[PDB]
Amino acid sequence: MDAQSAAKCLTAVRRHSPLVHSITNNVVTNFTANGLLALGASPVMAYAKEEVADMAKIAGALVLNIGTLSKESVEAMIIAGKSANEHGVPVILDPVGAGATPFRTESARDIIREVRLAAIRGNAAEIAHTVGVTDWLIKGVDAGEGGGDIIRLAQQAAQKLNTVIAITGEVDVIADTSHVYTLHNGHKLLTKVTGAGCLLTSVVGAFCAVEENPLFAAIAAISSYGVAAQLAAQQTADKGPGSFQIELLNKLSTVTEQDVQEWATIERV
Amino acid sequence: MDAQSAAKCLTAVRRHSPLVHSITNNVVTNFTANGLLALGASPVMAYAKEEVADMAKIAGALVLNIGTLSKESVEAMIIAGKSANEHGVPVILDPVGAGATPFRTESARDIIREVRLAAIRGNAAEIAHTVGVTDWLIKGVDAGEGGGDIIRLAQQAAQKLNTVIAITGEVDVIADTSHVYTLHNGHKLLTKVTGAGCLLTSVVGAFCAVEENPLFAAIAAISSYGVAAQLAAQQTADKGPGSFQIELLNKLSTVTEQDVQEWATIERV
Amino acid sequence: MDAQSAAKCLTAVRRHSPLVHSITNNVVTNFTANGLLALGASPVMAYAKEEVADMAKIAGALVLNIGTLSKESVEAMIIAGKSANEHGVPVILDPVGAGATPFRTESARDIIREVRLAAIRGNAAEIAHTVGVTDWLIKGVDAGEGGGDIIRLAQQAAQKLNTVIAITGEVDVIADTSHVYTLHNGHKLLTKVTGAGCLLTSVVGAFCAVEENPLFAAIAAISSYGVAAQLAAQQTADKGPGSFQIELLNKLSTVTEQDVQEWATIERV
Numbered sequence: 001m002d003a004q005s006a007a008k009c010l011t012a013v014r015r016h017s018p019l020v021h022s023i024t025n026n027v028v029t030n031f032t033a034n035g036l037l038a039l040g041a042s043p044v045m046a047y048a049k050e051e052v053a054d055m056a057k058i059a060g061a062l063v064l065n066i067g068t069l070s071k072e073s074v075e076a077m078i079i080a081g082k083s084a085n086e087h088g089v090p091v092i093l094d095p096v097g098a099g100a101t102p103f104r105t106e107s108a109r110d111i112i113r114e115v116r117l118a119a120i121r122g123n124a125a126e127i128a129h130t131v132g133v134t135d136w137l138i139k140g141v142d143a144g145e146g147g148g149d150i151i152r153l154a155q156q157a158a159q160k161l162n163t164v165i166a167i168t169g170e171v172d173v174i175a176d177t178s179h180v181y182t183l184h185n186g187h188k189l190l191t192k193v194t195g196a197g198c199l200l201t202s203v204v205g206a207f208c209a210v211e212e213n214p215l216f217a218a219i220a221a222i223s224s225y226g227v228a229a230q231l232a233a234q235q236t237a238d239k240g241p242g243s244f245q246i247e248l249l250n251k252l253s254t255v256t257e258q259d260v261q262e263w264a265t266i267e268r269v
Numbered sequence: 270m271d272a273q274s275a276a277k278c279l280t281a282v283r284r285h286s287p288l289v290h291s292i293t294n295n296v297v298t299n300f301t302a303n304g305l306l307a308l309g310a311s312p313v314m315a316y317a318k319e320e321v322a323d324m325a326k327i328a329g330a331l332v333l334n335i336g337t338l339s340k341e342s343v344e345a346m347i348i349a350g351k352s353a354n355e356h357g358v359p360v361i362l363d364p365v366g367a368g369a370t371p372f373r374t375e376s377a378r379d380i381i382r383e384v385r386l387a388a389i390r391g392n393a394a395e396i397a398h399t400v401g402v403t404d405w406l407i408k409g410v411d412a413g414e415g416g417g418d419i420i421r422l423a424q425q426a427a428q429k430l431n432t433v434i435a436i437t438g439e440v441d442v443i444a445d446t447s448h449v450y451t452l453h454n455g456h457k458l459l460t461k462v463t464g465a466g467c468l469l470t471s472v473v474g475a476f477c478a479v480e481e482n483p484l485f486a487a488i489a490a491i492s493s494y495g496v497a498a499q500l501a502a503q504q505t506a507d508k509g510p511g512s513f514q515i516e517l518l519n520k521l522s523t524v525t526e527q528d529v530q531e532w533a534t535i536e537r538v
Numbered sequence: 539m540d541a542q543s544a545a546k547c548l549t550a551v552r553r554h555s556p557l558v559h560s561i562t563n564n565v566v567t568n569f570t571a572n573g574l575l576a577l578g579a580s581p582v583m584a585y586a587k588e589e590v591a592d593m594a595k596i597a598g599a600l601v602l603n604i605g606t607l608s609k610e611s612v613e614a615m616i617i618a619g620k621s622a623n624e625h626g627v628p629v630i631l632d633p634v635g636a637g638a639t640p641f642r643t644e645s646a647r648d649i650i651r652e653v654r655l656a657a658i659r660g661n662a663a664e665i666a667h668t669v670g671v672t673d674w675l676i677k678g679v680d681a682g683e684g685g686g687d688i689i690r691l692a693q694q695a696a697q698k699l700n701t702v703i704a705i706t707g708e709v710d711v712i713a714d715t716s717h718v719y720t721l722h723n724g725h726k727l728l729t730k731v732t733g734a735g736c737l738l739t740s741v742v743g744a745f746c747a748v749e750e751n752p753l754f755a756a757i758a759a760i761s762s763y764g765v766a767a768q769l770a771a772q773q774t775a776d777k778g779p780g781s782f783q784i785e786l787l788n789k790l791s792t793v794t795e796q797d798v799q800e801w802a803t804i805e806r807v
């Protein structure tokens with residue numbers, strides 16, 4: 001895929017306005033919903049065991065996030081995932097905090113055993129503890145803590161689970177069983193807005209609802225989000241993280257196809 | 270009622286600063302509270318069964334919203350409603366998603382059987398499944414999917430439950446047992462801000478706390494909110510949904526009596 | 539302590555970026571996290587009984603808030619507090635609504651019996667019902683409902699629990715077993731932003747993670763927050779509470795040491 005192609009998937013999402021069902025944490029519910037609305041999609045949050053199966057079956061995509069998990073919410077995520085798997089609705093997982101505490105690592109591993117996933121998104125450490133692999137990294141600072149080792153972790157995980165693995169960082173690495181790509185987009189102010197990464201996972205869900213190949217959907221989602229963020233930072237930079245949060249939402253609704261073609265960097269490895 | 274009268278109820282709300290108790294969904298808690306504070310009221314959220322009855326009895330109004338309901342939260346809403354009914358505190362209901370899943374339709378019907386309501390607010394479909402009536406509509410696009418049929422649904426529901434029914438849309442229809450009105454106010458950017466409709470339901474609650482006739486309170490609440498939204502969009506328009514959300518809050522605190530008299534359209538049918 | 543000293547603790551917080559674990563209400567989760575990120579700290583929310591002990595032990599500080607409490611969340615706060623007490627992590631408590639309903643007063647008293655606290659923050663009424671003392675006051679209006687009586691309540695509570703007591707109001711009163719101070723900072727627009735007080739409690743937590751004497755940490759935290767708020771209001775004033783919320787976040791990230799030295803008023807009694 002290329003910048004031109006990613007830009008086309010963005011226009012598709014806006015034309016179809018897919019329904020994205022989220023079972024997420026309570027620190028990012030409002031931001032995630034506002035971001036999806038700004039982008040042009042339709043968000044819906046539902047967590048009760050008596051309704052998740054019914055809501056998941058009528059959605060375009062299902063997004064699972066364990067940020068502030070509980071025994072009952074993990075049980076609901078699995079019931080919802082099974083329902084989506086039965087009706088052909090792509091499911092995306094964000095294993096927030098996997099590795100930080102055993103309860104999170106356990107819940108993450110349980111979900112991947114019971115639900116077939118179209119994609120998994122998180123930092124290096126979160127992905128390694130979820131799949132149970134090697135190569136350890138949190139995010140990195142400068143120079144280079146290892147690029148080939150991250151590329152290797154991504155491919156190994158993707159091959160074992162037969163899904164798409166997107167490891168985010170200053171440089172994004174995305175891969176499926178037989179392909180690997182590195183992405184250069186975004187701005188550091190995204191680290192000062194809670195839920196920024198989570199919103200990205202939901203946007204990936206929106207793109208998967210309109211593009212059949214999950215690898216292409218993920219690449220187009222991450223490239224579009226990153227360009228919106230950079231353009232927002234240019235207008236937001238020395239004002240602060242408060243103004244950036246608001247301008248990010250504005251840009252998610254005004255970013256064009258030409259913008260993505262000009263500022264998104266996609267490289268096949 | 271007229272624009273002049275609606276404008277007077279707004280000044281009343283600001284003078285009394287009523288305490289509005291909300292039992293709502295976790296996607297709109299922060300926005301709903303900030304909007305009520307901006308308007309000039311006092312919000313309070315409490316959901317535990319061991320305290321809802323005590324909190325409801327000291328409030329000026331009670332607002333129930335099933336956006337992200339659970340078995341226990343529906344039970345709490347009913348305990349709270351019964352307490353308010355015992356101490357003369359008006360109760361308002363927003364049956365979010367009624368009809369979307371059977372669990373939501375069931376919970377909505379259970380609440381209206383056990384609690385006496387001053388008003389119910391939602392779209393056409395939500396109102397029809399909650400009361401169990403005819404006439405089906407989601408929101409409409411252009412031309413006219415039927416105005417008289419919506420007017421009929423509103424009056425039928427209002428007569429059966431002896432309460433006020435407010436069906437929102439590009440054109441708002443409000444009615445009680447013997448009166449019907451259509452309202453023309455607002456801006457479409459309200460559809461790009463999550464919780465915008467919910468905030469409106471809470472504002473109706475604030476107005477009911479200071480005006481004895483619930484039909485008049487609802488008309489004045491919806492007219493004032495809509496004018497604040499239009500004035501915000503004029504200053505927010507080509508910047509985006511992010512800037513609009515912030516300007517809506519600003520306008521809820523600066524909108525005047527003259528503003529409402531000039532831009533709110535109220536028509537008795 | 540003085541303005542010069544408080545300013546130094548601010549730079550410390552930004553250099554260390556402490557991890558602050560919050561077990562709080564769902565009306566202020568997003569705002570609290572964004573404020574901590576803006577300030578320069580690292581927030582983490584976790585509420586499940588199967589993980590709070592593990593998360594608390596690796597944090598720099600623990601913050602407990604009963605704003606929208608439940609039977610299970612109070613149980614979790616206590617398990618988390620015990621763990622922090624075992625690993626030397628300072629714990630801060632915000633007894634939101636203590637006195638409003640017996641369930642809140644009871645839960646607040648249970649926490650102070652089971653957990654050793656570095657500090658407690660709330661209004662006069664909340665502090666009196668939590669500790670079970672005299673002197674009653676909500677916030678005050680003008681003239682003077684009693685300054686010496688508030689000073690007395692603070693010292694009595696601090697002596698009995700051997701902790702720091704911070705009673706907020708137009709004038710802030712902070713004290714420990716043998717010292718008392720009054721602080722003059724902030725702006726009234728903080729009352730129009732939900733979670734403003736709660737964010738302050740979390741900021742106190744961030745400062746306690748880097749300064750050994752909790753009294754000094756609290757003084758420096760409250761002075762810095764108040765100066766950021768005043769500077770934001772100067773740029774936000776006649777636009778509204780919406781713009782202020784956003785500018786407050788901006789200022790929490792741009793406020794300097796010189797700013798605090800110039801606009802914070804600290805007086806030892």
Ligand SMILES: Cc1ncsc1CCO
Pocket residue numbers: 033043044045046294296297336337365463464467
């Ligand atoms: C997006 C969303 N999901 C359940 S409630 C809600 C807020 C708008 O009612």
Ligand SMILES: Cc1ncsc1CCO
Pocket residue numbers: 302312313314315563565566605606634732733736
């Ligand atoms: C409005 C509200 N209700 C319970 S907590 C809260 C946030 C301010 O403490």
Ligand SMILES: Cc1ncsc1CCO
Pocket residue numbers: 025027028067068096194195198571581582583584
């Ligand atoms: C700060 C925070 N705590 C648990 S989830 C979360 C949102 C970012 O994932």
